[PDB]
Amino acid sequence: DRGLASANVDFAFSLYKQLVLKAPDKNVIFSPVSISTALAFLSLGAHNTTLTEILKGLKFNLTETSEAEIHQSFQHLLRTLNQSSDELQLSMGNAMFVKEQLSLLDRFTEDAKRLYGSEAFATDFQDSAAAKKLINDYVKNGTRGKITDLIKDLDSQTMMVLVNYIFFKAKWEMPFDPQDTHQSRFYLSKKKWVMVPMMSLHHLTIPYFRDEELSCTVVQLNYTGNASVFFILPDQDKMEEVEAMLSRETLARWGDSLEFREIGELYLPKFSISRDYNLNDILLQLGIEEAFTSKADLSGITGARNLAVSQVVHKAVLDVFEEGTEASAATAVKITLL
Amino acid sequence: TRTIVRFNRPFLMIIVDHFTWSIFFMSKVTNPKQA
Numbered sequence: 488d489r490g491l492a493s494a495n496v497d498f499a500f501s502l503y504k505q506l507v508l509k510a511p512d513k514n515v516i517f518s519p520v521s522i523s524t525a526l527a528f529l530s531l532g533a534h535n536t537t538l539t540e541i542l543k544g545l546k547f548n549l550t551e552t553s554e555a556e557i558h559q560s561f562q563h564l565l566r567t568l569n570q571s572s573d574e575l576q577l578s579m580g581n582a583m584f585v586k587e588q589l590s591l592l593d594r595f596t597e598d599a600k601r602l603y604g605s606e607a608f609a610t611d612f613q614d615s616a617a618a619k620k621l622i623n624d625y626v627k628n629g630t631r632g633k634i635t636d637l638i639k640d641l642d643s644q645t646m647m648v649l650v651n652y653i654f655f656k657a658k659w660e661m662p663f664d665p666q667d668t669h670q671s672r673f674y675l676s677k678k679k680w681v682m683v684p685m686m687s688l689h690h691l692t693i694p695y696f697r698d699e700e701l702s703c704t705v706v707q708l709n710y711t712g713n714a715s716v717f718f719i720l721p722d723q724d725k726m727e728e729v730e731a732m733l734s735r736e737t738l739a740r741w742g743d744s745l746e747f748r749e750i751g752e753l754y755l756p757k758f759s760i761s762r763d764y765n766l767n768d769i770l771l772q773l774g775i776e777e778a779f780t781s782k783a784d785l786s787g788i789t790g791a792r793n794l795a796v797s798q799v800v801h802k803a804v805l806d807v808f809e810e811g812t813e814a815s816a817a818t819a820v821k822i823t824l825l
Numbered sequence: 826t827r828t829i830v831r832f833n834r835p836f837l838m839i840i841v842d843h844f845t846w847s848i849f850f851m852s853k854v855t856n857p858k859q860a
């Protein structure tokens with residue numbers, strides 16, 4: 488839990504930096520914990536260099552933790568995330584879609600069900616359209632219709648797809664009144680704006696920290712339940728400077744520096760954004776290489792070195808509005824014969 | 826002199842779980858109306 492948080496947060500910011508590097512002008516929205524869980528799931532079947540590259544890419548310090556420690560930690564995380572709750576809707580699922588003829592070690596299938604909650608669905612990938620619809624329906628069901636087209640293309644020689652989804656629906660602790668939402672400017676740059684519905688709250692007391700060293704303002708808005716949002720507002724033209732300082736250490740400093748403050752007015756756009764990603768280049772920059780090559784070692788899955796990753800994809804959606812927030816995401820790991 | 830927090834320029838959002846310290850979602854909003 489302590490070491491899982493630290494590794495997952497390091498991974499989150501490393502992932503964020505590469506996404507911005509790849510597409511510097513774009514909105515960003517993704518689920519770190521979905522991607523971490525999908526790749527941890529994958530590592531269950533990896534061996535030797537393929538394995539250690541994944542665990543190190545996930546930012547786990549292997550001199551301080553072991554493979555068994557990691558998987559048990561993800562098992563506990565998933566159990567905690569899927570606990571019943573009347574305050575907030577939160578769920579995460581894992582699944583594996585396998586060609587029926589593919590022979591799987593009983594140890595792999597058992598550990599997948601036990602540690603990651605995954606069933607094993609027989610899938611005829613040679614009927615790619617049906618196989619695609621089944622996987623996308625699984626994700627659509629898990630995200631309550633929010634993630635509809637996670638799998639766009641599916642090679643007919645696919646042997647296995649590992650899938651993780653996360654669904655999140657929460658109410659603001661202090662919700663916005665829709666009668667206070669009015670069209671206002673959102674500045675894309677100093678001289679260009681777009682018009683958006685700007686929600687507002689008045690006379691609210693919330694955690695606040697003006698970070699003069701980083702030229703940004705940080706506020707924490709709570710959801711009902713154990714979830715909250717850190718909002719970070721860089722001064723005009725300081726986004727890239729703030730992004731360069733994004734790290735576990737910086738988030739910890741922000742968190743320790745929050746103090747309750749009375750805010751006269753808070754203005755927040757009502758918005759919905761969505762992004763989908765091909766994570767292949769990103770994961771390679773993070774050191775996850777052998778799983779994609781002819782030297783891939785996934786013999787923990789089948790007992791032979793006969794599988795290799797072809798593609799890792801991710802899609803996420805974020806919906807912010809007066810009553811609360813809806814967000815969901817899914818990650819898929821596509822695997823072929825080697 | 827009251828304080829005003831106005832998210833009318835690009836900002837970040839980090840949705841976190843106080844229980845597990847998981848980051849559920851991380852976002853940069855550069856354009857709420859971006860294609």
Ligand SMILES: C[C@]12CC[C@H]3[C@@H](CCC4=CC(=O)CC[C@@]43C)[C@@H]1CC[C@@H]2O
Nearest residue numbers: 492493496735738739742841842843846
């Ligand atoms: C900031 C925070 C306490 C510190 C946590 C943070 C989540 C990310 C993180 C993980 C770590 O392992 C170091 C401390 C931090 C930075 C938590 C989110 C809610 C809580 O306030």
